[PDB]
Amino acid sequence: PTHLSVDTKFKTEGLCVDIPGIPKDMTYRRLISMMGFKMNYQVNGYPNMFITREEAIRHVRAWIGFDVEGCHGTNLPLQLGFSTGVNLVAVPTPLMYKGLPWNVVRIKIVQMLSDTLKNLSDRVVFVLWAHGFELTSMKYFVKIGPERTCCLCDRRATCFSTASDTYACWHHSIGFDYVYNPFMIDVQQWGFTGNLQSNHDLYCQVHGNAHVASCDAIMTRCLAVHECFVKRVDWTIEYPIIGDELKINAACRKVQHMVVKAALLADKFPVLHDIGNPKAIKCVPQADVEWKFYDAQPCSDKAYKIEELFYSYATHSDKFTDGVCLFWNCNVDRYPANSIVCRFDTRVLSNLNLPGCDGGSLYVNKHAFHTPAFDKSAFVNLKQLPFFYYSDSPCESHGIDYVPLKSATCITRCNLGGAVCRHHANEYRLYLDAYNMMISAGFSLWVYKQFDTYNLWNTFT
Ligand SMILES: CNC(=O)c1cccc2cc[nH]c12
Ligand SMILES: [Zn+2]
Ligand SMILES: [Zn+2]
Ligand SMILES: [Zn+2]
């Protein structure tokens, strides 16, 4: 069982208000036929328009919530809402657009999906809370057939043009009018009691219901993300490389060793309390410090209460007041004052970060991590960690042309002694690039208020 069988049953109770008299017994095969799509027995890579919950999770970057509200059935106009906040009105003659015929509506749909998805996925997954009109309207903007490649490149075809009779991916679809071979999934098939708003509002206070189709489309994708990434967590699923994943991850490792090593040199803490990843390793292996590890998986729902991390039942818990605490991506409600902290800012706009549930976001870099909403108050006992570069390594070149470096934040023997050497200038600039890579990727660094880089200069005496 790799794909969803067309002979699987589709619960139709949710479709009987827009479609009165629909059979209770219904397969995907009969539903697709009813929707106007002739699969004509095809073994060419597109076995079903609808996908499994598992296939949907592997393709989370393609998720676009879709809702159609029957505004006034090729007799009345339809309001087409997308989780992008777009509302289009199709006529059969929070961004809201006036009534227009399908021939122009379908052009806008291709433009919008292509701009949204080109840098995220090779496909679209229409996430629905199906009531009837969204499925019966797909024949107006969707064409299906064998799997294909773009006319201008080797990527999988996601759009079709009736004007030129050619196929294109999301990058080369300008002027294309049909969505080609889309995927879709009905959230109602997962067995819910009650309507969309009641199920959504159980877990999210951030998306309201302004009664437009995009509002439902957003709430639908939000509820799907909650079910698949907040309540259900699968860290085994790997996701393709689409951006700066390898550079961002390497930068995080360089930044972590740098910041922790400098803190241990500047304030000579005897013990370090490392909380978070149960698979974490000593980021500064040569440090003198007593390195103690505490297991806490990434919290995907709400941030950990600092108090519950010490709830040791009938035994005494450790005193974190001695030494320093390292919370590298361990999201707590209020950090202790003696901490070094890396906290992902969920508000960041990027191709790695997808909108999440209740203010949080779904960070997808090798794995999907739903992260709780960023909260500035978690850092009240700390300060924003300033940029600095520290190096005790020898001033030795080993060899890109050179411009002399002048910086107050290059903490080296050469800078103390008057002039930065070529090696430390190359290393400072590389470290500044990795630092900016990680900050721009959404990460934020915080440190105990007594942290001072002035204390680092005397480690050369
Ligand atoms: C930081 N957390 C602790 O010191 C600790 C120590 C011993 C048991 C438990 C259970 C939860 N936390 C514990
Ligand atoms: Zn292409
Ligand atoms: Zn929501
Ligand atoms: Zn030097």
Contact (Cβ atoms closer than 8 angstroms) between residue 334 and residue 377 = yes
**Quick one: which atom of ligand 1 is closest to the CA of 313?**
10
Q: What are phi and psi of 259, to 5 degrees?
A: -65, -45
Helix H or strand E segment including 395 = none
Which residues are in the CB-under-5-Å shell of ion ligand 2?
150, 152-153, 155, 169, 171-172
Long-range contacts of 42-46 (CB under 8 A, 24+ apart): 42/145, 42/146, 44/145, 44/146, 44/147, 45/146, 45/147, 46/144, 46/145, 46/146, 46/147, 46/181
Nearest-angstrom CA–CA distance, 131 and 79: 14
Name 310's Cβ contacts closer than 8 Å, sequence gap at least 6: 317, 318, 320
Q: Which of 89, 74, 163, 159 is nearest to 122 (CA)?
A: 159
| Binding-site residue set | 67, 69, 134, 150, 153, 169, 172, 200, 204, 207, 211, 216, 222, 274-280, 395, 414, 421, 424
Please count the other Cβ atoms lying within 10 Å of the Cβ belonging to residue 211.
8
> Which amino acid appears at position 440 of this protein?
S
The experimental technique used to determine this model is X-ray
Cβ-Cβ contacts under 8 Å for 410 (sequence gap 6 or more): 389, 420, 424, 425, 428
Query: Separation of 182 CA from ligand 3 center, angstroms?
Result: 24
CA distance 50 to 64: 14
Ligand 1 atom 9, closest CA: 312
Distance CA 416, CA 459 (A): 11
Question: Would you say 345 and 330 are in contact if contact means Cβ atoms under 8 Å apart?
Answer: no
Sequence-separated contacts (24+) of 423-427 with Cβ below 8 Å: 423/393, 423/395, 423/396, 423/397, 423/398, 424/391, 424/393, 424/395, 426/400, 426/402, 427/389, 427/391, 427/393
CA dist list (Å): 288 to 115, 348, 455: 52, 37, 17
Whether the CB of 327 sits within 6 Å of ligand 1: no
With residues binned 3-state (H G I as helix, E B as strand, rest as coil), the percentages for the chain, rounded to 5, are: 30, 20, 50
The candidate with the shortest Cα–Cα distance to 375, out of 351, 350, 341, is: 341
* Ligand 1 pocket, residue 309 CB under 6 Å: yes
Catalytic residues: 67, 69, 134, 211, 216
Cα separations (Å) of 86 from 40, 172, 245, 458?
A: 34, 22, 29, 58
Please check whether residue 62 is in contact with residue 113, taking contact to mean a CB–CB distance below 8 angstroms. no
Nearby residues of 53 by Cβ (< 8 Å), 6 or more positions away: 185, 190, 228
The H-or-E segment that residue 79 falls in is strand 78-82
Query: For residue 275, which atom of ligand 1 is closest to its CA?
Result: 1
Instruction: Tell me which residue of 176, 143, 169, 141 sits closest to 154, measured CA to CA.
Output: 169
Is the beta carbon of 332 within 6 A of some atom in ligand 1?
no
Both tokens of residue 125? 């997954």
Q: Distance, CA 153 to ligand 2 centroid (Å)?
A: 4
Report the candidate in 259, 348, 356 with the shortest Cα–Cα distance to residue 302. Answer: 356
Residue 318 CB–ligand 1 contact under 6 Å: yes
Two tokens, residue 348:
């960041």
At what resolution in Å was this solved? 2.4
Q: Could you tell me how far CA 42 lies from the centroid of its own chain? A: 34
Q: At what angle do helices 245-267 and 422-440 cross, to 10 degrees?
A: 110
The Cβ of residue 428 has, within 10 Å, a number of other Cβ atoms equal to 22
